[model samples]
Target: MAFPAGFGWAAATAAYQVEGGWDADGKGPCVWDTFTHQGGERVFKNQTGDVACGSYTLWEEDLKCIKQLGLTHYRFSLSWSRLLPDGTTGFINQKGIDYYNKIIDDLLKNGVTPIVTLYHFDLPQTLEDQGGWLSEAIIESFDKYAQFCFSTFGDRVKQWITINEANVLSVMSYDLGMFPPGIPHFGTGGYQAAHNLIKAHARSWHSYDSLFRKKQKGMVSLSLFAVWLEPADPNSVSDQEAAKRAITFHLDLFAKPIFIDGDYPEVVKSQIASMSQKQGYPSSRLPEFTEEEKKMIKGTADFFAVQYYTTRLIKYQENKKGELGILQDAEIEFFPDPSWKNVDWIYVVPWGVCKLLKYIKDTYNNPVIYITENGFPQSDPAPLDDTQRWEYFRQTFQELFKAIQLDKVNLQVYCAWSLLDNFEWNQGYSSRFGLFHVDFEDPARPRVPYTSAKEYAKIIRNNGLE
Candidate 1:
């Protein structure tokens, strides 16, 4: 099963996940720094990203993993605070800029294309002190940052992702209190954050579309995480509808605005509107965009950048109907089969990926789609053999190939979740998702090739499985 011409196989890393020099060279503090330093309470084992894999200093070693893998592309994020210590262009950090310049130059020289993401859960803590994603003021700040990146790196970097998983950031951070600026019992803050992030993405797209596109000729979109839902009971219609409800309320909240109608999903709006009345709010907790803003946001994406790991079966929870909020409105409970093999939160289901990809094709009319992250994580102190990891990729990729061929889903590039094991936020160094194993206990932070790596390298060299 050979892939199509010009298909790219890549792996990704984030700034806080890899670069260990937390406060080096005038780099401002980020939310992750603040979150992990909350003593033993926030992250697992109270592990901070302070010296994660030592990528800031050992980048040459990091690049060796990419070269060894025969990767056609490398996807990575820019640490916003590193470039602008204040989260604005008022003062730029040249050393931070210089670090990435060399990395980008080195990747290009080695014949690997670089795909850069502007933010990856590492918001400048300075910005958090002034509202972070909670305020629309960050939009202007984000746009200025986007403009600066476009002007400086646009000449070399061809593909740009504006932000990493806006959906996850909004929900996990604002509502669940699982991430930075963690607000507990945030009833409407999630929607507020989502609304602003969508607008922020639109601003970046338009900024590049109007300014840098002619000269630099680059592509830009925000990365959105995907969680596919299958009906818990195939014979039950209500259970099936619960799956649909979960899709619209959760995934479509951001997808609808950017991809389809430039607005919130109609089902979501109606449900939230009725729920708001019951909750005694004057207006729907979900924000509404002005007509002009809608048009501005429409058609802003060049492609869809999706990060997918697992899928869960959704059973309609009728008992929760009397509860409150979106859960009552959606009424779905998701769980993996008790028999499925899993590590931490991810459950393996290859066919669910096919369903999700085809769902995008049928529903969103299939804008060019590229998978930005997909891989399995191992438990603490992983082994180098990692046969389980290899099988997970092999199974997932086989189904993905089916989606591309039999289902005719317009999927393009595919990138593994990571190249090297480094900092995993919240889970910390305990859960590893890398093809190359890194010793967290070592001062050198040496990376050892997993058995999965050789198989993956073979698959990459052949452009697909045989």
Candidate 2:
């Protein structure tokens, strides 16, 4: 099947993940910098993004690689600390703005569209010390930061993603204690942190609507990490229902509020409230949005930005074993089956994309969507042949095409997970997710295209399957 013209095909990268020079050019520190520097056992082999890919200096090489890929759109994130330096507009870094301005101008000059994410996991360390997303104070500050971005770059950048993955940072940083600012508050903390993130996103969206939209006519959306869940035993209705609950607790916690109804999922509300009461808490662990807040938050997204990779089979389970965090809340057990092919963390299931897109269409009235990140990452010491990576894209793209044409899903963009291998968060540089194999050992970090890169370029040239 051939994609219609105007559909976007590109490779995506985050600011912290790709651009090194962690301390270069008056860029303030982010939580990830602190997290990696904490040293003892924070990241794999204690690897940091200090010079991973070195794109902050070698951006010209990235532009060359983007051209080699024949990309129509190049999706990347703006480093918050790089621009604001301290997460506020008081101290604007001219060098930071100039760097982005250079990239945007060059991309447009080369006939490539720019899709920019304002915040991608890298929260300014100063803000994190201000209790981060745990406090509502950050919401006002985020609006200011987002407003600065829209005002500065909204003219040329027509597509804007307000935040990369709110739930990921909220859960990992605020609750699970795995990523940055790692504090293990568990249960209620993740919920509350995510709650604030939702409010911040809503404020950013309204800021754009009031100030930038009339002049710039740019689209703004918050990106969510996509995880499609299926019943471990498809025939069992209980497992089926449990799978639904898992989905509600996972990504839809952010999705439903922003896209569908502007409120937390009903299943989540009932579950957390019931558990909180039984545990002797006076109030539900989950925060509440006031009536006015709900109305404002509802229908804020102009498009859907999804970062999809893997799926899990969920089964009905009880909290009898006393599990601690999100699993106990959802009352389900999720795991990738041994039979499926995967990179130990992200699994391969082409059908999952079709089903997830269909569910999105049916559940949210088929909003315009951009697959902002989707790619396969192999273990360290990656090979150039990359047969598994080739098959992953081939099958995933076929299903994505089906979701668009047959299911009538309003899918517009399919930006691959990455262009060059860079520092993976927490997992560090151990996992490589790039069409172009980067020589991490080389001080210059030169890039060499894997076989999949050539095949991917062919698909883009032909507009679909050959």
Candidate 3:
């Protein structure tokens, strides 16, 4: 195994997923809090994250888990509502600032680097009530929120993710209506939200670069959720092109603007324009980026932060029909790989990681990458053994090594999806994606290390699996 000396092991979690003190210490409500607490049939079993893994109170335990795993880095997100309490309108919550400062200082004290994400799906509900991502007004508000985080945490946190999975946020929240602020306006709403998010991301990036980068010496990027796609009909030229379109629609839509071209992909512009015209829209559903905005957002990231988990097979469909969403624009159908084992939407396609890395390298000029979130998720009634999860990790690491060695992909860090099983967004607690299993039934929410935890610790200690 020829893993680079700089390559490091890490694990991640989001603020809403782990930090369960929803209203503790003057914290304001977020969209997830509003969605789940409404007592509807939205989440699994109508569960809410009122009390998750209890990481807010038991953060020392979380720190111990990271240290015990021999991890070199720890990645986590800061809750915007916790910090600002009421988005950018209200007073700063010193308690929230204190909470994250303690975590960052602890990580640094323990010889681990702290990688922080500014936003991870949990938008302050006050902001959402005013229009959420759907409004163009959010761009400046998000910039203010981001600047606050950078100024407050920049001295300690060296690596920053401006937004975690902007694509997922736009699609799930606005397009599919599966997540919070659930408004399923696939064509018009999703595009507008995405545009605002892209602009907001660029603003945050530029803010840090301009104000705090030199003194803080920190890097900022977005954690893009990527799915490796393959053509189902290998011999069909249309299917092959459809697969490319799938990538462009999902990954390239955001990547091209920041990393490659500073504007939306030409394919995206043309296809959305044609689709909107067909749907009887006055102009393109996607809002245009001004020249000044384009230049501001260009080359804003220091590296590519990717969160990958699954692969899908894409086939060309001549007469595809769906609610006017992003998928409808592509004219493709996606299916799970038949040969692989499946758990919900995730399929065990280890080679897809290598393919994804190579695609990023060849397509986007080979920027340095950090696999910010990658892990296997198992359903409930899980035993303590978790042999399947261990095996999944083993296979994924093998493919990641190949991406680094054979493919020459500039991959640096690998952070598991989570360090502890916590609140999954819409799925609630039913889906567990953690090396250490958290018994949510217990009041303590005690974490018991699964077999994969030991295996992962060994890999981190040895710097490679033998």
Candidate 4:
């Protein structure tokens, strides 16, 4: 794979997944805390991230791991509970603030860039109790929380991602009810939550734009989760449209509002509306974006971040309706390519990353994009050889090179999914996605690297893959 001349390499982690001390200091309980402790019937061992990686207590050691990898940057998320105890500036968690200060200082000392996420689905439980992102008041609450973060830590933190994977959060939290605040209120409930999140993101963007950017000189953007899609039969027009919708729903739902300066795409709006009508709902299940909201959302990001992993082939079908055309959603089935099925949902499709990046550039006018998340998952009992994981990196980065060299996409950074093995959401510890393998089987929790880590470290140090 040909690597970009000035590309930076980073490792990523989220608050709940990495940081323990869930209720430490004055930090409030988060929805994840509530979900794992009281609600998650499906979680692994019904386990919570109350102490996932223990990075909260072992920041220095984790920083050493980043240095050992020869990384230029480290991307991580801050729990809203720790950052803003009750979604307000009034209660400050001294321990939480102190922990971040130490880590930021260490990263700067080690010449590592700190990329921090403002929200990573670990919203304070008080906020969830108060309707979470479904309430319009969350805009003000998030702005306040973001302003606090910028004021407190913006000096050392030069890269800021406002939120990570809102689609995942919306789908799991509000629709499918797989993760925290699990609810099956599919249509409008999810819409309302997503709408409020968009507005909150806009407000946070404006806060940074107005207060922090000039002083801290940081970049602010949201990280989107996407999968590339191809028509089952490339020659068929109907299959092609289905491919577009699958691609559009995953990428465009978030992109239309923030990057493209538009509301939800017409396809998504009408499909949900028709579904709502069929289900005896009054109006469209989707919330309408006001003209003023449109202006607020447009041009909100200085760049873009994407978390892409797999691809799907889609085919269109019609339900037995007399209506001219009723799309039954795309059918996605995975074939085990590369012949190594380490995890259930993930299969190797490095070319998909290239297509996904190219699609982003062509579809959304080529905003500066970062490969925020692109690592494969494995089943437990870490493979010492781990050739598949190493190859996953090799091929995906190769595809990224193709997108940049051939497609002329403005891709900036590439952060791996994680630095060390930590808790996987509902799949729990069953899924493993980390550069450095952590022995959860051991009480001491040793971090050991499979061959992939060495390959990645050399790639980072040399500023390209060998």
Say which prediction, candidate 1 or candidate 4, comes out ahead on lDDT: 1
The weakest ten consecutive residues by lDDT in model 4 span 322-331
- Lowest summed-lDDT stretch of 10 residues in model 3? 317-326
- Model 2 score (lDDT): 0.89
Tell me the tens digit of each residue's lDDT in model 3 across 329-382: 778899986688977788989899999999999988989999999998889887
**Which prediction has more favorable lDDT, 2 or 4?**
2
For all candidates in order, the CA lDDT equals 0.88, 0.89, 0.89, 0.80
Model 2 per-residue lDDT tens digits across residues 167-204:
78888888888888877987978988899999999999
Reference-based TM-score of each model:
0.98, 0.98, 0.98, 0.94
Residue runs of model 3 more than 4 Å from their true location after superposition: 319-323
TM-score of 2: 0.98
Candidates sorted on lDDT, descending: 3, 2, 1, 4
TM-score, prediction 1: 0.98
